[PDB]
Amino acid sequence: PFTADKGKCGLPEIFDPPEELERKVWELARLVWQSSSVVFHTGAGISTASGIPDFRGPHGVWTMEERGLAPKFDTTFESARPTQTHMALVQLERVGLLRFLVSQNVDGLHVRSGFPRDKLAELHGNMFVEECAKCKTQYVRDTVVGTMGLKATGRLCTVACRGELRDTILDWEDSLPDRDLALADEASRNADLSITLGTSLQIRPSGNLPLATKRRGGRLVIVNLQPTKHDRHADLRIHGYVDEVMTRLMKHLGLEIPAWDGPRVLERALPPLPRPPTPKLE
Ligand SMILES: Nc1ncnc2c1ncn2[C@@H]1O[C@H](COP(=O)(O)OP(=O)(O)OC[C@H]2O[C@H](O)[C@H](O)[C@@H]2O)[C@@H](O)[C@H]1O
Ligand SMILES: O=S(=O)(c1cccc(C(F)(F)F)c1)N1c2ccccc2-n2cccc2[C@H]1c1cccnc1
Ligand SMILES: [Zn+2]
Structure with missing residues (x-):
């Protein structure tokens, strides 16, 4: 925790000019x-526009710590609303244009946005989710679970059990969850397009997965304000606010960004909805 390498923090932001x-x-x-199989990889920069600071941006938690300053939240985790970006990802999966979703965030917004837990990998855990150490059942709570580092929360399992409930928040020591990692790894290997949103790609193996798509010749797109660790492996790099990038993309795709109903949990992905027909691209 004290010794932990927090990577490169506070590098300058890049703004593509508007044209x-x-x-x-x-x-x-x-x-x-043109893609048969798209996998989106997300990090802390997709939640900054709902009041949650990132780790390594100009005012992220590790950056500010290096300067002796505190980070600032403009919301609680419970009151946070999902961004336009979150909601765009909800809709892309409902129309069959997102195949799988890989995220490093523990903020619980992808689940709460209504995104289906069976197309989502939560590599670093989820602050609202506690897990039965005996039977592995997960409970998605309406408030943050008070502990981090895979410790006992003090509640027990209700399954038709009495096992000890634990948070799912990884500590620096802890290895990633294998279901999640293997699923994310399988998705990244078979993807023909991996799009990274608001991650600096510095954590391994989470930050390496998009590169897997490069094997068998897939394409890689990074959308990020700062430089990322793999900027030279990318076929396209977009330097802009992710909400502005996601909203313009949705408009080109002819899709609406749908309304959030408030906190909801969807376990299993629904049947695919109609989508616009595709343009002819020479
Ligand atoms: N609105 C925005 N639009 C585009 N980019 C943005 C925006 N806001 C922030 N960024 C970019 O967002 C990037 C966010 O990168 P980082 O802060 O490293 O977070 P991670 O998710 O990759 O952190 C990985 C893990 O490391 C930790 O230990 C935890 O374990 C994490 O789970 C920055 O470069 C910003 O320029
Ligand atoms: O910075 S933290 O307090 C944190 C967490 C774990 C370990 C440290 C450490 F540096 F002290 F080791 C700090 N911090 C945090 C704060 C409250 C609840 C949970 C977290 N959290 C868990 C993993 C990373 C963070 C992280 C975070 C997560 C999402 C958005 N913003 C910050
Ligand atoms: Zn149990």
Whole structure:
């Protein structure tokens, strides 16, 4: 915790100017339309626009710590609303254009946005989710579970059990959950397009998964304000706010960003909804 390498923190942000931002967002569209299999990888930068600071941005938790400053939250985790980005991902999966979702965030927003838990991998855990150490059943709570580092919460299992309930928050020592990791790994290997949103790609193995898509010749897109660890492996790099990138993309795809009903848990992905027909791309 004290010794832990927190990577490169506080690097400068890059702003594509607007004509270049438009041409790159069109090309991202172009790639989504030609792909058989898209996998989105997310990090802390998709939740900054709902009041949650990131780790390594100019005012992220590790950056500010290095300067002797505190990070600032403009919300509780319980009151946080999902961003436009979160909601765009909800809709892309409902229309069959997202195959699988890989995230490093523990903030619980992808589940609460209504995104299906069977197309989602929560690599670093989920602050609302506690797990039965005996039977492995998970409970998705309406408030954050008070502990981190896979400790006992003090509640017991209700399954038709009495096993000890534990948070799912990984500590620096802890290895990733295997279901989640193997699923994310399988998805990344078979993907023909991996799109990274608000991650600096510095944590392993979480940050390496998108590179798997490069094997067998897949394409890789990074959307990020700062430089990331794998910027030179990318076919397209977009330097912009993710909400502005996601909303323009959705408009090119002819899709609405749907309304959030408030906190909801969906275990299993629903049957695919109709979607616009695809443009002819020479
Ligand atoms: N609105 C935005 N639009 C685009 N990019 C953004 C925005 N806001 C922030 N960024 C970018 O968002 C990036 C966020 O990167 P980082 O802070 O390293 O977070 P991670 O999720 O990769 O952290 C990985 C793990 O490491 C930790 O120990 C925890 O274990 C995490 O689970 C920055 O470069 C910003 O420029
Ligand atoms: O910075 S933290 O307090 C934190 C967590 C674990 C370990 C440390 C350490 F540096 F002290 F080791 C700090 N912090 C945190 C704060 C409250 C609840 C949970 C977390 N949390 C868990 C993993 C990473 C963070 C992280 C975080 C998560 C999402 C958005 N913003 C920050
Ligand atoms: Zn149990």
